[PDB]
Amino acid sequence: LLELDKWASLWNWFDITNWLWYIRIFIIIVGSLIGLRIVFAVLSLVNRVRQ
Amino acid sequence: LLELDKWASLWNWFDITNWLWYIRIFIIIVGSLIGLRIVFAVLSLVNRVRQ
Amino acid sequence: LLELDKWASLWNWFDITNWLWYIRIFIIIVGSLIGLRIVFAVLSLVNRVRQ
Numbered sequence: 001l002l003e004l005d006k007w008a009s010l011w012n013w014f015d016i017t018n019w020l021w022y023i024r025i026f027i028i029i030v031g032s033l034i035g036l037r038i039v040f041a042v043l044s045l046v047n048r049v050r051q
Numbered sequence: 052l053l054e055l056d057k058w059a060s061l062w063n064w065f066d067i068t069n070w071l072w073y074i075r076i077f078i079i080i081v082g083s084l085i086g087l088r089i090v091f092a093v094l095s096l097v098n099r100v101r102q
Numbered sequence: 103l104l105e106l107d108k109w110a111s112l113w114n115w116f117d118i119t120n121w122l123w124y125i126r127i128f129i130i131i132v133g134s135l136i137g138l139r140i141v142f143a144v145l146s147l148v149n150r151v152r153q
């Protein structure tokens with residue numbers, strides 16, 4: 001079941017341990033990833049005449 | 052608050068437990084979604100033929 | 103580790119708690135945010151008709 005001992009016990013093989021409480025930092029990075037996309041839209045204007 | 056007894060209470064309908072579990076995986080799905088969106092640019096090009 | 107004492111005790115300043123139960127939700131908000139990006143493609147070309 002869910003308990004303090006279970007969280008500390010998960011430290012045996014490290015793989016789920018790191019991914020369980022360090023994903024949130026990576027989460028913020030995935031946000032701005034959509035923001036940068038907007039500059040891309042100007043390329044559509046050039047897509048008609050091509051490079 | 053939350054504890055061993057609190058989580059086990061949701062084991063009968065576990066409706067919310069399904070959502071409160073695996074959320075991390077869902078974000079990963081939304082990570083590849085942003086790249087796929089780029090292909091949509093082709094949709095705009097044909098707007099020149101329509102009204 | 104984790105315990106109902108750590109969560110409730112955290113309510114003394116509630117400063118980090120706000121960051122612990124608001125940013126998680128922000129992910130879902132960022133979902134629709136990426137879908138909204140598509141209109142930009144149309145808006146990119148519309149500039150040739152309107153300033």
Ligand SMILES: Nc1c2c([n+](CCCCCCCCCC[n+]3c4c(c(N)c5ccccc53)CCC4)c3ccccc13)CCC2
Nearest residue numbers: 001002006007010012013015016017058059061068071072
């Ligand atoms: N030697 C091993 C063991 C185990 N693994 C499986 C993974 C065990 C670690 C993850 C445990 C996380 C528990 C929390 C997840 N969790 C949460 C919540 C619930 N309501 C949950 C309900 C049921 C289960 C988990 C829940 C609500 C919020 C979270 C191994 C895997 C690889 C190698 C060796 C392993 C299992 C036993 C031995």
Ligand SMILES: Nc1c2c([n+](CCCCCCCCCC[n+]3c4c(c(N)c5ccccc53)CCC4)c3ccccc13)CCC2
Nearest residue numbers: 007010016017018019020021022103104108112115117118
């Ligand atoms: N898979 C994991 C999970 C979890 N954990 C525990 C995460 C706990 C985060 C809070 C730590 C900062 C506390 C700041 C609050 N806090 C405290 C105190 C003060 N005097 C403060 C003063 C000012 C501000 C805050 C203060 C005194 C005592 C606390 C893991 C830990 C390691 C590895 C894997 C983990 C949890 C779920 C999964």
Ligand SMILES: Nc1c2c([n+](CCCCCCCCCC[n+]3c4c(c(N)c5ccccc53)CCC4)c3ccccc13)CCC2
Nearest residue numbers: 052053057060061064065066067068109119120121122123
């Ligand atoms: N017929 C039903 C009954 C009951 N249920 C249970 C109600 C749901 C309880 C969920 C517990 C949430 C606790 C959140 C604690 N928690 C956490 C974190 C924070 N940052 C927090 C900040 C503030 C407060 C709590 C916090 C960060 C991590 C946790 C049902 C549920 C679904 C369907 C039918 C149900 C009960 C009786 C009948």
